[PDB]
């Protein structure tokens, strides 16, 4: 197995990648067209569905019976990322399916997901798309761990896709297996907490990355926390969670970006993160609603043939 394999699908996800290329060879893309695809790519895995040149009820029955294939072209690995929009209709299909395999593997993988803000289309989507990992994470029993990052109102997409290759590099960085006291195991007991810890629901969760002690201690209600030093000296068993590790990063190891790097585990936050969703759609669904218009200019006293000519 490899250390990592990074999966991308859809738009965003294609987008996303094009920072990553450095990567190379564990990096995997996906999508239903070759609209995002760029020459950037050929240095990365790139696979598109067959037949299928927004709406995620059409997109699903094509891509389905594929599912089986894309995975063969997936290398098993001791850890995934997988990336994606909660918005659109590609990403946010692709993305959730292979998600449901990677589980049956009985696989260790975070995902980074967008939560797309345009229209009332994308919003609907956002929901059943995180409606869909949280069925995911029921039916495999599993926690579906994803940074939510939403496409907030004035901000680029360049500058949202800038944040989450750097917290995707993170997450490369932890699973690296090149840390004191860092087990494959110990990254894999992180993110399935609820193998060992039975009690536990499986569902949703967040991961927050953080570069402080004072912004990991204020995730709220942390259920499993993995923290990077790398000055020993600086380690500090803080807050509450119910399963705590650590590992020592090396100061000759070139992809160690900051002194500290937590990376908790929650869930009670994804109550807002769906309330925000569903509030904004319910503002915008009330203005279409609301919305008039003029009565025809045509009526029943006017002759009106086969092809629409009143003459
Ligand atoms: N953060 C971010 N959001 C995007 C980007 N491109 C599109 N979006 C938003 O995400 C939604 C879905 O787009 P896309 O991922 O291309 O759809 P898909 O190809 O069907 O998966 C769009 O309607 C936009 O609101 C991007 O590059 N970065
Ligand atoms: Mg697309």
């Given at each position: 197995?490899?250390?990592?394999?990074?999966?991308?699908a859809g738009?965003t996800?294609?987008?996303?990648?094009?920072?990553?290329?450095?990567?190379?060879?564990?990096?995997?893309?996906?999508?239903?067209?070759?609209?995002?695809?760029?020459?950037?790519?050929?240095?990365?895995?790139?696979?598109?569905?067959?037949?299928?040149?927004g709406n995620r009820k059409v997109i699903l029955?094509?891509?389905?019976?594929?599912?089986?294939?894309?995975?063969?072209?997936?290398?098993?690995?001791?850890?995934?990322?997988?990336?994606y929009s909660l918005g659109g209709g590609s990403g946010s299909v692709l993305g959730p399916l292979?998600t449901?395999?990677?589980?049956?593997?009985?696989?260790?993988?975070?995902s980074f997901v967008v939560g797309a803000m345009e229209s009332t289309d994308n919003l609907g989507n956002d929901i059943d798309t995180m409606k869909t990992l949280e069925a995911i994470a029921v039916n495999?029993?599993?926690?579906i761990?994803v940074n939510y990052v939403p496409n907030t109102q004035?901000?680029?997409?360049?500058?949202?896709?800038?944040?989450?290759?750097?917290?995707?590099?993170?997450?490369?960085?932890?699973?690296?297996?090149?840390?004191?006291?860092?087990?494959?195991?110990?990254?894999?007991?992180?993110?399935?907490?609820?193998?060992?810890?039975?009690?536990?629901?499986?569902q949703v969760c967040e991961?927050?990355?953080?570069?402080?002690?004072?912004?990991?201690?204020?995730?709220?209600?942390?259920?499993?926390?993995?923290?990077?030093?790398?000055?020993?000296?600086?380690?500090?068993?803080?807050?509450?969670?119910?399963?705590?590790?650590?590992?020592?990063?090396?100061?000759?190891?070139?992809?160690?970006?900051?002194?500290?790097?937590?990376?908790?585990?929650?869930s009670v936050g994804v109550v807002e993160i769906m309330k925000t969703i569903t509030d904004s759609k319910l503002e915008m669904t009330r203005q279409q609603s609301?919305?008039?218009?003029?009565?025809?200019?045509?009526?029943?006293?006017?002759?009106?043939?086969?092809?629409?000519?009143?003459?």
């Amino acid at each position: 197995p490899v250390k990592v394999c990074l999966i991308f699908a859809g738009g965003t996800g294609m987008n996303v990648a094009t920072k990553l290329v450095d990567l190379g060879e564990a990096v995997h893309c996906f999508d239903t067209c070759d609209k995002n695809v760029v020459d950037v790519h050929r240095s990365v895995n790139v696979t598109l569905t067959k037949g299928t040149r927004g709406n995620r009820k059409v997109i699903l029955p094509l891509v389905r019976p594929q599912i089986p294939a894309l995975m063969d072209t997936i290398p098993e690995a001791d850890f995934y990322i997988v990336c994606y929009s909660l918005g659109g209709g590609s990403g946010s299909v692709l993305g959730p399916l292979i998600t449901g395999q990677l589980a049956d593997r009985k696989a260790s993988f975070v995902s980074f997901v967008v939560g797309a803000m345009e229209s009332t289309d994308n919003l609907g989507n956002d929901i059943d798309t995180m409606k869909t990992l949280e069925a995911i994470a029921v039916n495999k029993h599993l926690p579906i761990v994803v940074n939510y990052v939403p496409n907030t109102q004035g901000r680029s997409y360049e500058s949202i896709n800038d944040e989450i290759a750097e917290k995707i590099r993170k997450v490369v960085l932890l699973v690296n297996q090149n840390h004191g006291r860092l087990d494959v195991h110990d990254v894999a007991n992180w993110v399935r907490f609820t193998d060992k810890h039975n009690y536990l629901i499986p569902q949703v969760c967040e991961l927050h990355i953080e570069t402080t002690r004072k912004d990991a201690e204020n995730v709220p209600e942390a259920i499993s926390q993995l923290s990077l030093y790398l000055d020993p000296s600086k380690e500090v068993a803080f807050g509450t969670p119910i399963y705590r590790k650590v590992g020592i990063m090396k100061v000759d190891d070139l992809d160690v970006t900051d002194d500290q790097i937590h990376f908790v585990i929650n869930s009670v936050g994804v109550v807002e993160i769906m309330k925000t969703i569903t509030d904004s759609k319910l503002e915008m669904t009330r203005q279409q609603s609301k919305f008039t218009q003029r009565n025809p200019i045509i009526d029943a006293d006017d002759n009106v043939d086969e092809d629409g000519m009143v003459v």
